[PDB]
C-alpha cells in the first residue's frame, strides 16, 4: 500500500508515459494484501484502500 503510494508518488513526478508506467506498477503491488482478503475473507479495498489510507508521508 505504501509501495503503491510510495511508487505512485514517484509516478506523477516522472512525467510522460513513464509517469503512467510507474503508476501501473504501483497497482499490481496491491494484490498481495488482497489475496489476504481471499483467505481471511477480508474486503479487498476496505483492506487495501484503507491500507493506503494510512500515512503522513509514505513509509
Amino acid at each position: 500500500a505504501a509501495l503503491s503510494i510510495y511508487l505512485e508518488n514517484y509516478a506523477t513526478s516522472m512525467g510522460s508515459r513513464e509517469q503512467l508506467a510507474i503508476a501501473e506498477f504501483a497497482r499490481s503491488l496491491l494484490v498481495i494484501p488482497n489475496t489476504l482478503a481471499v483467505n481471511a475473507a477480508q474486503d479487498s479495498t476496505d483492506l487495501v484502500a484503507k491500507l493506503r489510507a494510512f500515512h503522513n508521508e509514505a513509509q
Binding site: 505512485e8 506523477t12 489510507a53
Partner: protein, 73 residues
C-alpha cells in the same frame, strides 16, 4: 462542403467571447485544469480511501479525458 464549419467558428467566438462577458472570471480552457484535477483528487485516492481510491481515482482518471481524447485522437 467546407463552408459549414467555417461559420461555426464565428458564433462560438461570439458566444465564448460573450461568455468571457457573461462571466468575467475565466479559467484556462482546453483541458488545462483536468490534468492536475486527477492529482488534485488522486491525493485523496491516496489519503481517505476505504474503497474511495477507486472512487476518487477513476474519477481522477475521468477528469483528464477531455484533453486526453483530443490529444490521443
Amino acid at each position: 462542403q467546407f463552408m459549414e464549419e467555417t461559420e461555426r467558428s464565428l458564433h462560438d467566438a461570439i458566444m465564448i467571447v460573450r461568455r468571457a462577458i457573461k462571466n468575467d472570471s475565466v479559467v484556462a480552457g482546453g483541458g488545462a485544469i483536468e490534468m492536475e484535477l486527477s492529482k488534485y483528487l488522486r491525493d485523496y485516492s491516496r489519503t481517505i480511501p476505504g474503497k474511495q481510491q477507486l472512487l476518487i481515482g477513476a474519477y481522477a482518471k475521468a477528469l483528464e479525458i477531455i484533453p486526453r481524447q483530443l490529444c490521443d485522437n
